[PDB]
Design a binder for this molecule. Structure first.
Ligand SMILES: [Mg+2]
Ligand SMILES: [Mg+2]
Ligand SMILES: [Mg+2]
Ligand SMILES: [Mg+2]
Ligand SMILES: [Mg+2]
Ligand SMILES: [Mg+2]
Ligand SMILES: [Mg+2]
Ligand SMILES: [Mg+2]
Ligand SMILES: [Mg+2]
Ligand SMILES: [Mg+2]
Ligand SMILES: [Mg+2]
Ligand SMILES: [Mg+2]
Ligand SMILES: [Mg+2]
Ligand SMILES: [Mg+2]
Ligand SMILES: [Mg+2]
Ligand SMILES: [Mg+2]
Ligand SMILES: [Mg+2]
Ligand SMILES: [Mg+2]
Ligand SMILES: [Mg+2]
Ligand SMILES: [Mg+2]
Ligand SMILES: [Mg+2]
Ligand SMILES: [Mg+2]
Ligand SMILES: [Mg+2]
Ligand SMILES: [Mg+2]
Ligand SMILES: [Mg+2]
Ligand SMILES: [Mg+2]
Ligand SMILES: [Mg+2]
Ligand SMILES: [Mg+2]
Ligand SMILES: [Mg+2]
Ligand SMILES: [Mg+2]
Ligand SMILES: [Mg+2]
Ligand SMILES: [Mg+2]
Ligand SMILES: [Mg+2]
Ligand SMILES: [Mg+2]
Ligand SMILES: [Mg+2]
Ligand SMILES: [Mg+2]
Ligand SMILES: [Mg+2]
Ligand SMILES: [Mg+2]
Ligand SMILES: [Mg+2]
Ligand SMILES: [Mg+2]
Ligand SMILES: [Mg+2]
Ligand SMILES: [Mg+2]
Ligand SMILES: [Mg+2]
Ligand SMILES: [Mg+2]
Ligand SMILES: [Mg+2]
Ligand SMILES: [Mg+2]
Ligand SMILES: [Mg+2]
Ligand SMILES: [Mg+2]
Ligand SMILES: [Mg+2]
Ligand SMILES: [Mg+2]
Ligand SMILES: [Mg+2]
Ligand SMILES: [Mg+2]
Ligand SMILES: [Mg+2]
Ligand SMILES: [Mg+2]
Ligand SMILES: [Mg+2]
Ligand SMILES: [Mg+2]
Ligand SMILES: [Mg+2]
Ligand SMILES: [Mg+2]
Ligand SMILES: [Mg+2]
Ligand SMILES: [Mg+2]
Ligand SMILES: [Mg+2]
Ligand SMILES: [Mg+2]
Ligand SMILES: [Mg+2]
Ligand SMILES: [Mg+2]
Ligand SMILES: [Mg+2]
Ligand SMILES: [Mg+2]
Ligand SMILES: [Mg+2]
Ligand SMILES: [Mg+2]
Ligand SMILES: [Mg+2]
Ligand SMILES: [Mg+2]
Ligand SMILES: [Mg+2]
Ligand SMILES: [Mg+2]
Ligand SMILES: [Mg+2]
Ligand SMILES: [Mg+2]
Ligand SMILES: [Mg+2]
Ligand SMILES: [Mg+2]
Ligand SMILES: [Mg+2]
Ligand SMILES: [Mg+2]
Ligand SMILES: [Mg+2]
Ligand SMILES: [Mg+2]
Ligand SMILES: [Mg+2]
Ligand SMILES: [Mg+2]
Ligand SMILES: [Mg+2]
Ligand SMILES: [Mg+2]
Ligand SMILES: [Mg+2]
Ligand SMILES: [Mg+2]
Ligand SMILES: [Mg+2]
Ligand SMILES: [Mg+2]
Ligand SMILES: [Mg+2]
Ligand SMILES: [Mg+2]
Ligand SMILES: [Mg+2]
Ligand SMILES: [Mg+2]
Ligand SMILES: [Mg+2]
Ligand SMILES: [Mg+2]
Ligand SMILES: [Mg+2]
Ligand SMILES: [Mg+2]
Ligand SMILES: [Mg+2]
Ligand SMILES: [Mg+2]
Ligand SMILES: [Mg+2]
Ligand SMILES: [Mg+2]
Ligand SMILES: [Mg+2]
Ligand SMILES: [Mg+2]
Ligand SMILES: [Mg+2]
Ligand SMILES: [Mg+2]
Ligand SMILES: [Mg+2]
Ligand SMILES: [Mg+2]
Ligand SMILES: [Mg+2]
Ligand SMILES: [Mg+2]
Ligand SMILES: [Mg+2]
Ligand SMILES: [Mg+2]
Ligand SMILES: [Mg+2]
Ligand SMILES: [Mg+2]
Ligand SMILES: [Mg+2]
Ligand SMILES: [Mg+2]
Ligand SMILES: [Mg+2]
Ligand SMILES: [Mg+2]
Ligand SMILES: [Mg+2]
Ligand SMILES: [Mg+2]
Ligand SMILES: [Mg+2]
Ligand SMILES: [Mg+2]
Ligand SMILES: [Mg+2]
Ligand SMILES: [Mg+2]
Ligand SMILES: [Mg+2]
Ligand SMILES: [Mg+2]
Ligand SMILES: [Mg+2]
Ligand SMILES: [Mg+2]
Ligand SMILES: [Mg+2]
Ligand SMILES: [Mg+2]
Ligand SMILES: [Mg+2]
Lengths: 100, 146, 51, 63
RNA sequence: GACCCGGUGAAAUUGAACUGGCCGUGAAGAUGCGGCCUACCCGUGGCAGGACGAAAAGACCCCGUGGAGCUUUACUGCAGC
RNA sequence: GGGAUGACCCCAGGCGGUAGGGGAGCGUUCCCGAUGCCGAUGAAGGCCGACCCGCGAGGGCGGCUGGAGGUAAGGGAAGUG
RNA sequence: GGUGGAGCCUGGGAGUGAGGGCGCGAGCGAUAACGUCCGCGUCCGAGCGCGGGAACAACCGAGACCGCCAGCUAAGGCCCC
RNA sequence: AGCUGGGGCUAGGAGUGAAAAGCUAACCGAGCCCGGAGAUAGCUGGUUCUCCCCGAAAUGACUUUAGGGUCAGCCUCAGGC
RNA sequence: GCUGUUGGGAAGCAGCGCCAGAGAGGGUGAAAGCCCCGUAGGCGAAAGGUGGGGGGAUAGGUGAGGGUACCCGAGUACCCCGUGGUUCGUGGAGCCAUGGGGGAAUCUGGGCGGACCACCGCCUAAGGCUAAGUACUCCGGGUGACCGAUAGCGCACCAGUACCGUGAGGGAAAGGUGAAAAGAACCCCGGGAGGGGAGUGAAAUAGAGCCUGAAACCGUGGGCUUACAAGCAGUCACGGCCCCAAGGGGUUGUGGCGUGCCUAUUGAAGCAUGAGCCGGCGACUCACGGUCGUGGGCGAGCUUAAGCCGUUGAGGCGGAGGCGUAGGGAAACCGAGUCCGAACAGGGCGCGUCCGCGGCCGUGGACCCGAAACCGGG
RNA sequence: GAGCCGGUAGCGGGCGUGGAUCCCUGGAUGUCCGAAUGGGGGAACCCGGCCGGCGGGAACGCCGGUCACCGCGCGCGCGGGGGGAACCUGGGGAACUGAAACAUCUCAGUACCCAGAGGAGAGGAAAGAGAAAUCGACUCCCUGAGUAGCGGCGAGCG
């Protein structure tokens, strides 16, 4: 509904914060909190588990949601918002112009 | 000009005076102070004291209306023939209340004082001095009886 | 103040134009802006509207 | 709302042109009072004073 | 029970109080005003004389052009007859 | 009254105040001014201030606290103290 | 004679219609009451804000715009407090 | 004329009462709850910022009126004289 | 709409741009027209509701004449008695309804035009239907000189809930970590809770019913001060002592002087009333009229109302009407006069609105609180 | 049109660019109570009859239909019954209040109760209005107008 947004599980630039400009991979959309996770915010989760298994070695702990109004998608371009081209039967996301 | 100062020229008097006070209308809620001005008084134009306050007067104004009411009678407005004299032409109703006087009700009784212009008024009643005034300059016809 | 809606559309959307119909002239929308530009077919309706 | 004119004060009080208020003098009233003697002559038409300021505030709209 | 110690620990009341006694005085019954006289600061257990102590916006009286209950050969109705 | 207006400048009086009447103002919320101007080089708010301006209501400035809103001069409407 | 928050008139807004002490003139009372009812005031009311009266609304002195670590005074005092 | 469990009836100017005006969901001379209803209150309480000016009355007439009100007296504001 | 910048973070600042039929708003780590959602504009319905707004047909409608007095709504009209409705309260009481009683005619009928009667009119009762415009707001949407958690609904939250009540019914409080849970791994004390480290984060006196977090209150540390003192708790004066070093503030030792606040009062420190303290909520408004003032407009003119047409927080059209221009009189009526009167004595009375704003008044609940009660339905 | 399996955070369990999750529209199933409606009932439960179905079985069971009552026409069939924040019409209808007491009056045909009805209701085509050789259904809004009037001719209503 309103909950649909920029893009889906592809590679995408983030222009947010500390990671102002970082091309991350496939992004794993959240989106009820309107975020993705993609590759940027990598903050440490100081948690054991809920089920006590394979205990604490190091923390290379996982990512964070990264609110999705700052993940600029990519094509042979940089940024350039998505658009809709329909071609009489489909609905494809073509950027401000390069292609694709 | 701009929205800074077109503002009203120094006289609005709008201290719409709230008596929330301690200085101003000092806390007995200016004018008040005793009791029986505590949320109401009865008139005090017709009213009290409780004596008559004036019913000791007496209705001379008779023929005060049998139950169907005022007979829907003609009522002649009275213009002076000096206030008729502001214009020129065949002065008639609708050179009247179309412009100015007579307030639309029933037809016209010119009367009065002033410089009778020579012009033939089709009025619908006359005072004797108005007739004697404008026959001394002009003429007039009379009412409609159609 | 134009009686041409296809320039009211053009000037509808600026930080410094209050667009206006030729009949909707009013002193508040006059005074809240610093300039006034009106058509001949808005000045004619304004001149015949007022005395 | 729409301040009602006192019909009693209309029926027993006349508002003049310049602002006074006139009524019958009291005591002639079919007499209930006495025999003759020029008081019934002098029951003509007075005008009340400083009671108009409490009385013209009743009769407003049809004078 | 009260009193001491250990535990939990309310209340009505409360203008602030750093709250003595007497003669006066003051809205006419004062810790607070004046004069004097006592009087180190702070408790604990008590007795209750005062703080016009608390409690109940007197329950008696009066006023309300209040309100009810009730009565009747008050007035006027209505039921009923 | 003096004024070669700029009515600032002096002069003679007055200036306790309840109910009240009258005149000036200061504030709070909201709005026009505002698609503006301020504001993370820290907003409203909070704590202070021995400073500043105002007779006062209050307003400024400075210091921390606060971590994101505030809204000028002139005006308007109050759920205004 | 009297230029005074004097008057007269019109209009707006009232408040007030529980007053009290003292003096004088009286009534009622008992030639009693900080009694009650008037008249002429006055003062408190609202001036107890101040001084004296030991204290103390109305007794005596006096009408408090604010300040001053200046002065002269009223009632009252001048041995001390 | 016993007491008591169960099942039931009677309800607001009505029930019920070996009668006290008692009882009727802990306060019954007419239950409680909602609604008219923000009843009414000539009564008591209370009325919220600041400054400046002027400043009363508690009297008369009339009141089913005496703690209230109308008018005049005293007060203020503006205008004219 | 990209870069650089301080920053935790940029959209802030700056440079170089661009769109605009879109510079309404929201969120984005803050301050974004150009990142997102959007908005302007424009598309979209297979299925269902919807709808003459647009055209289609149906059903129905098309004794103009002159006559033989056929029929025109029956316990009805009309009359009386009893009442309700309308402005109508018994009044001069019509009319419209109709509970009782008497009781007709069908067009030379019958009713009405305010007792009634006669002329002149008006109109057809005793059978029924009839869109539209109007009231409403559980509902959906937008709009706010509307509220921002005691406000707004009683409920922003799992609220008509807990709780009270047998019951009808009453009926609460209770929002906010941060950007993101990264919501604290691992130690150490402790049984645990809670801490202290470590870690997160810009910030952890932002650490979990957690933003800001005031005050009352309760502590701890420091300065001054008190155990021969007396007081509505202060104030003025000096003096002593630590803070700043000119002058200050903090303390208070002594002296001088001092009867709290509000209300009600003839008077209150009052041993009259209210107040434990603090924080919030809390009481002169508003609608329509009126009376005076003032700022304006117009000015013997003034002036819109409902409604109509149009918007973007564009307003015009609308003169129906209302005031005002002449008043007297009860009224006919007369008129710069009128009336009382026989009177050409005398005397009584004899010339602006529309807004805004304010004082005040009227009806409104009408400044707010509070009755005992009354009545209806349960 | 790429994520989902509601307010999921956890079992990890699956499911989706051959189209899911969602949203809308149309069906289907809708237990039981409720107008409750087969009868009873102390609502959400009991107890049935007839027909048709499962030693699962003739007895107790369970399933799926149908079984209230009233109104309209020819045993036969189409409606009605209850609910709804207000809005409206009709049947009833107070009292405190105001009159500075109060009874007529006012409050008020208000509140409330009942019935009915619908997106509106009401009313409605003249046995009208009342001064015009006039208007021509009804309703609503503004004027008329606080007028005409009514009125213990008070209060006020209008
Ligand atoms: Mg497709
Ligand atoms: Mg106030
Ligand atoms: Mg009083
Ligand atoms: Mg008094
Ligand atoms: Mg009397
Ligand atoms: Mg533009
Ligand atoms: Mg008129
Ligand atoms: Mg112990
Ligand atoms: Mg007490
Ligand atoms: Mg002591
Ligand atoms: Mg002692
Ligand atoms: Mg004593
Ligand atoms: Mg002593
Ligand atoms: Mg003392
Ligand atoms: Mg004792
Ligand atoms: Mg006691
Ligand atoms: Mg008492
Ligand atoms: Mg009485
Ligand atoms: Mg009784
Ligand atoms: Mg009788
Ligand atoms: Mg003064
Ligand atoms: Mg005053
Ligand atoms: Mg503000
Ligand atoms: Mg800036
Ligand atoms: Mg603010
Ligand atoms: Mg600050
Ligand atoms: Mg500061
Ligand atoms: Mg400002
Ligand atoms: Mg308020
Ligand atoms: Mg308020
Ligand atoms: Mg009196
Ligand atoms: Mg007296
Ligand atoms: Mg005196
Ligand atoms: Mg005395
Ligand atoms: Mg005296
Ligand atoms: Mg004597
Ligand atoms: Mg004496
Ligand atoms: Mg006495
Ligand atoms: Mg005096
Ligand atoms: Mg004095
Ligand atoms: Mg003294
Ligand atoms: Mg003394
Ligand atoms: Mg002085
Ligand atoms: Mg000397
Ligand atoms: Mg001397
Ligand atoms: Mg028994
Ligand atoms: Mg039983
Ligand atoms: Mg009984
Ligand atoms: Mg009992
Ligand atoms: Mg009783
Ligand atoms: Mg009862
Ligand atoms: Mg009440
Ligand atoms: Mg009522
Ligand atoms: Mg009071
Ligand atoms: Mg003075
Ligand atoms: Mg009285
Ligand atoms: Mg007076
Ligand atoms: Mg005077
Ligand atoms: Mg005056
Ligand atoms: Mg920074
Ligand atoms: Mg924003
Ligand atoms: Mg922030
Ligand atoms: Mg933005
Ligand atoms: Mg569009
Ligand atoms: Mg279709
Ligand atoms: Mg179709
Ligand atoms: Mg339809
Ligand atoms: Mg017929
Ligand atoms: Mg018969
Ligand atoms: Mg008849
Ligand atoms: Mg009559
Ligand atoms: Mg005939
Ligand atoms: Mg007839
Ligand atoms: Mg007729
Ligand atoms: Mg007739
Ligand atoms: Mg007639
Ligand atoms: Mg219809
Ligand atoms: Mg309509
Ligand atoms: Mg919404
Ligand atoms: Mg707000
Ligand atoms: Mg808001
Ligand atoms: Mg809250
Ligand atoms: Mg709330
Ligand atoms: Mg809060
Ligand atoms: Mg809830
Ligand atoms: Mg219970
Ligand atoms: Mg956040
Ligand atoms: Mg722990
Ligand atoms: Mg806390
Ligand atoms: Mg906090
Ligand atoms: Mg200490
Ligand atoms: Mg000693
Ligand atoms: Mg010592
Ligand atoms: Mg002392
Ligand atoms: Mg001292
Ligand atoms: Mg002293
Ligand atoms: Mg004092
Ligand atoms: Mg007094
Ligand atoms: Mg006394
Ligand atoms: Mg006290
Ligand atoms: Mg005491
Ligand atoms: Mg007491
Ligand atoms: Mg008292
Ligand atoms: Mg003008
Ligand atoms: Mg049009
Ligand atoms: Mg004359
Ligand atoms: Mg006004
Ligand atoms: Mg009654
Ligand atoms: Mg789930
Ligand atoms: Mg599908
Ligand atoms: Mg599917
Ligand atoms: Mg689904
Ligand atoms: Mg099935
Ligand atoms: Mg059943
Ligand atoms: Mg049954
Ligand atoms: Mg059962
Ligand atoms: Mg088988
Ligand atoms: Mg078988
Ligand atoms: Mg069956
Ligand atoms: Mg059919
Ligand atoms: Mg029904
Ligand atoms: Mg009554
Ligand atoms: Mg009454
Ligand atoms: Mg009475
Ligand atoms: Mg009525
Ligand atoms: Mg209809
Ligand atoms: Mg009908
Ligand atoms: Mg017809
Ligand atoms: Mg009408």
């Amino acid at each position: 509904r309103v909950k649909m947004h920029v893009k889906k599980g592809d590679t995408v630039l983030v222009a947010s914060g500390k990671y102002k400009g970082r091309v991350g991979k496939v992004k794993e959309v959240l989106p009820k909190k309107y975020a993705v996770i993609v590759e940027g915010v990598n903050i440490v989760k100081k948690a054991v588990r809920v089920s006590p298994k394979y205990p604490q070695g190091g923390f290379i702990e996982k990512e964070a949601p990264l609110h999705a109004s700052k993940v600029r998608p990519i094509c042979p371009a940089c940024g350039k918002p998505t658009r809709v081209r329909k071609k009489f039967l489909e609905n494809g996301k073509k950027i401000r112009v390069c292609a694709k | 000009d701009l929205r800074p100062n077109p503002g009203a020229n120094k006289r609005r008097k709008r201290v719409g005076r709230g008596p929330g006070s301690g200085h101003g209308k000092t806390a007995t809620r200016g004018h008040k102070g005793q009791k029986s001005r505590s949320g109401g008084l009865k008139d005090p134009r017709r009213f009290e004291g409780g004596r008559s306050t004036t019913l000791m007067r007496l209705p001379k104004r008779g023929m005060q209306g049998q139950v169907p009411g005022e007979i829907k009678r003609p009522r002649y407005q009275g213009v002076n023939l000096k206030d008729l004299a502001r214009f020129e032409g065949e002065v008639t109703p609708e050179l009247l209340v179309r412009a100015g006087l007579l307030k639309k009700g029933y037809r016209l009784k010119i009367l009065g004082e002033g410089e009778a212009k020579p012009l033939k008024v089709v009025a619908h009643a006359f005072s004797k001095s108005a007739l004697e005034k404008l026959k001394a300059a002009g003429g007039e016809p009379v009412l409609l009886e159609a | 103040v134009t009686g041409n809606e296809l320039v009211r559309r053009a000037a509808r959307n600026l930080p410094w134009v209050v667009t206006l119909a030729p009949e909707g002239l009013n002193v508040y929308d006059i005074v809240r802006t610093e300039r006034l530009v009106m058509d001949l077919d808005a000045w004619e309706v304004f001149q015949n509207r007022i005395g | 709302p729409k301040m009602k004119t006192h019909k009693g004060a209309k029926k027993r009080v006349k508002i003049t042109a310049s602002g006074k208020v006139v009524a019958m003098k009291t005591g002639k009233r079919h007499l209930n009072w006495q025999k003759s003697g020029k008081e019934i002559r002098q029951k003509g038409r007075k005008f009340v004073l400083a009671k108009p300021e409490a009385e013209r505030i009743k009769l407003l709209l049809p004078y």
